[PDB]
Amino acid sequence: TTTILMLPWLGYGHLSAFLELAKSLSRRNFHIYFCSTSVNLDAIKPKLPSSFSDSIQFVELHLPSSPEFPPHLHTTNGLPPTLMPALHQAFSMAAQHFESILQTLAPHLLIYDSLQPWAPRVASSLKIPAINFNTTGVFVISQALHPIHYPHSKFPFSEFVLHNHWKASTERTRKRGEAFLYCLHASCSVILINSFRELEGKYMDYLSVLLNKKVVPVGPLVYEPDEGYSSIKNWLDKKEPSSTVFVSFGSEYFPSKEEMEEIAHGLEASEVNFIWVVRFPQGDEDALPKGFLERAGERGMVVKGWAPQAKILKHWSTGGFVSHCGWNSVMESMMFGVPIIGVPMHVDQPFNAGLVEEAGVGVEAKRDPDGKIQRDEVAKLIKEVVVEKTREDVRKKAREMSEILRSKGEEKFDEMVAEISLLLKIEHHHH
Amino acid sequence: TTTILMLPWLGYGHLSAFLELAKSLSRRNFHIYFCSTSVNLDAIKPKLPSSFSDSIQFVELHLPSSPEFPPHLHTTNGLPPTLMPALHQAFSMAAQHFESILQTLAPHLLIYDSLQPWAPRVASSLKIPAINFNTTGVFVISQALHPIHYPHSKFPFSEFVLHNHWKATERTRKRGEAFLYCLHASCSVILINSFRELEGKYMDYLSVLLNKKVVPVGPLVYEPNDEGYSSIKNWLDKKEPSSTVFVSFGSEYFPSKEEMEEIAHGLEASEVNFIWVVRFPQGDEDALPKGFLERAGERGMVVKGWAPQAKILKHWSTGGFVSHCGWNSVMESMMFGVPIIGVPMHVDQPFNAGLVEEAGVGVEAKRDPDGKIQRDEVAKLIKEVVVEKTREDVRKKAREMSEILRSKGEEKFDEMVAEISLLLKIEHHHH
Ligand SMILES: O=c1ccn([C@@H]2O[C@H](COP(=O)(O)OP(=O)(O)O)[C@@H](O)[C@H]2O)c(=O)[nH]1
Ligand SMILES: O=c1ccn([C@@H]2O[C@H](COP(=O)(O)OP(=O)(O)O)[C@@H](O)[C@H]2O)c(=O)[nH]1
Secondary structure, three states, rough: OOEEEOOOOOHHHHHHHHHHHHHHHOOOOOOEEEOOOHHHHHHHHHHHOOOHOOOEEEOOOOOOOOOOOOOOHHHHHHHHHOHHHHHHHHHHHHHHHHHHHHHHHOEEEEEEOOOHHHHHHHHHOOOOOEEEEEEOOOHHHHHHHHHHOOOOOOOOOOOOOOOOOHOOOOHHHHHHHHHEEEHHHHOOEEEEEEEHHHHHHHHHHHHHHHOOOEEEEEOOOOOOOOOOHHHHHHHHHOOOOOOOOEOHHHHOOOOHHHHHHHHHHHHHOOOOEEEEOOOOOOOOOOOOOHHHHHHHHEEEEEEEEOOOOHHHOOOOOOOEEEEEOOOOHHHHHHOOOOOEOOOOOOOOHHHHHHHHHOOOOOOOOOOOOOOOHHHHHHHHHHHHHHHHHOOOHHHHHHHHHHHHHHHHOOHHHHHHHHHHHHHHHHHHHHO | OOEEEEOOOOOOHHHHHHHHHHHHHHHHOOEEEEEOHHHHHHHHHHHHOOHOOOOOOEOOOOOEEEOOOHHHOOOOOOHHHHHHHHHHHHHHHHHHHHHHHHHHHOOOOOEEEOOOOOOHHOOOOOHOEEEEEOOOOOOHHHHHHHHHOOOOOOOOOOOOOOOOOHHHHHHHHHHHHHHHHHHHHOOEEEEEOOOOOHHHHHHHHHHHHHHHHEOOOOOOOOOOHHEEEEHHHHHHOOOOOEEEEEEOOOOOOOOOHHHHHHHHHHHHHOEEEEEEEEEOOOOOOOOOOOOHHHHHHHHHEEEOOOHHHHHHHOOOOEEEEEEEOHHHHHHHHHOOOOOOOEOOOHHHOHHHHHHHHHHOEEOOOOOOOOOOHHHHHHHHHHHHHOOOOOOOHHHHHHHHHHHHHHOOOHHHHHHHHHHHHHHHHHHHHHO
């Protein structure tokens, strides 16, 4: 049996994409070693059905540990953002344990994420072929690489303009982008990416040109399942159809008090039904404006910490998704046909939001010239998309996009499997 | 590799269910020999994605041939109904070739349909274990067995009453004996194409009556990914949502002119949009009332011969299904959330329509005392269910049933695989 060890970056959204890809490979008779830290392995285990455990085994990666930075913090999930440098540094120091794991398990292939340049190096040292897998979409990467080659010409296939709030240590920023691009550039023959040609094909071809490397899509990768759902479903069961927005900002971002107030007042003014997951950093309710939940009454529900996002998005009473536009959340909303109201925050999210808007399956709540979220913009877009449904074009496009994604089967993985087959056959000769 | 030879009955609906079951087994690393007549293998091949051809091989079964009954007639598909006796006899005369196939390929398991009592006997003579797989639902079988054991008591777990048109000779006994032998002769279990949410109490009753375990193998529903669809799609793309009824009576029934006239007149009175599949026997429009199509205009479409039923049922503009209530068409309609307007014709269809009515996912157009279809009932039910959506209870339960069936996965096959694994381990010792 052909074995693959998979090494996601230490974020929950990365674990998620990597696990869906592992399921696809296990269905093609590959045996998977799924490698991450124990806190991440525990968090993602509920998304692996028992029928897979025979062919997808979890393998614990050890990061350096101290009482100030213990194992339960070896993840971006709910991490204090001022510990993010520690997490990156600790991850790079796990390279020798990673080498021990690769020497012991001797997998035939490594698939690794885009935040660990050391990973393909350890694999090369052991004569193990390694392929990069990206859990973002294509648009953001192509937007990042384009000005390196064309610093005086605009990105040529989209009308998207990145708001100045996100355009705003130059060597360190360069070293981070160099590490990121190295992971892609170092990949054996192809890079894998969680996307599909109907949405990003021309960006795929453009990125392949800039990188001088084939880009292989493997998307849509979307997980489909009481973790608290019984109470949530009972409340949703009492709403009209397409009347409710889910509100969430993912696994590794905490919106500021001022940001929560603009969103909260946006929700209130829209008069929509809403389920809103509010989170607090691991060490640390009152993040919300005074009286907001009371005025909301039966229209509002705040879930603390974590919610069954997929089940909520698939409920008949859900008409919209106020999202930070993390890529898994975007793919999920598209697969389930729920139009997105974009409130992006950082990293790839402003690009994802622009791609959502450009494809016509959602809208973006624009920040003001100070870079602040606007309660009026949030309330307006929820009114048009969800409450009054005057944006019939967006709801239709979202429906049409869901029909497209629902039609995709295991053929979406054929190209990856053939490139894996070719790569191993070539390297077996050379070894 | 463990090998399974599958022998459906020579109907297209039996081929279809058996093929879906073959796919489920291929995904569990079984190798499938799919055995039938060449005219049936040709008919079903477009439903088998190319990725399965390495593990699902087609094996031709030869029936006695004559210029008056040549190979292209070796199927119920569009067969003149007066040739049905010749088809059964010809099927039974293939037992020698079937033995030759079994001796040559030496499969580890036979899965056989319920119209070939000779098939388990041939397997038993070669020490090949054999399991019966029923492509109907359970309701009809338990309704057939119940009066054998309780001739003076009502069927205990339903309100359904069979209309006298269908209630109306040791030869009937001999066919019932042959059917029940196929189930009774099955090794340890019987497989059936149903699910507990709809038929669980009937499964338990059937298991007690037969003194054999009944194993549901779930919603088996083929889903495609042009067969005349682009023209139909363009037509459908221009209707309102949920505005259209698909109309079909399956693979092996030609409604009479009197029935066609009642259905056409019901369709016209409802003023619904309709796509209507009209067929004529293999050898051989004229079957419809004068000017029915011209009066229908662009609201009506008649497809001759065959239609992409699943794609049409999944289309956003399809709001109902005027169906003979073949079980594959019922399962498909339920999976796709399309309420059924029942017009059953013979065999198991009246029972399937009753179950559909019982579940509230569809309605039955009642026949007249002498057995005549009622144009007024056809029109009334299409009016209430499709055109003017006043039967929201049916729509809702149709949507709720589709949500249940959409949530099912590969686990629906766990029980069948476990019993197969046990049966092969037991008979391995005994051989
Ligand atoms: O309360 C929550 C919040 C998030 N998610 C899931 O967590 C993942 C978040 O990934 P994403 O790419 O959207 O953003 P990130 O967490 O990486 O910032 C997605 O699968 C969401 O469905 C969830 O199940 N419940
Ligand atoms: O024009 C048609 C009519 C039927 N079918 C398919 O043929 C099968 C019919 O099986 P069913 O049990 O409903 O009826 P039967 O043909 O056995 O009487 C189903 O899968 C239908 O989707 C189809 O593809 N096109």
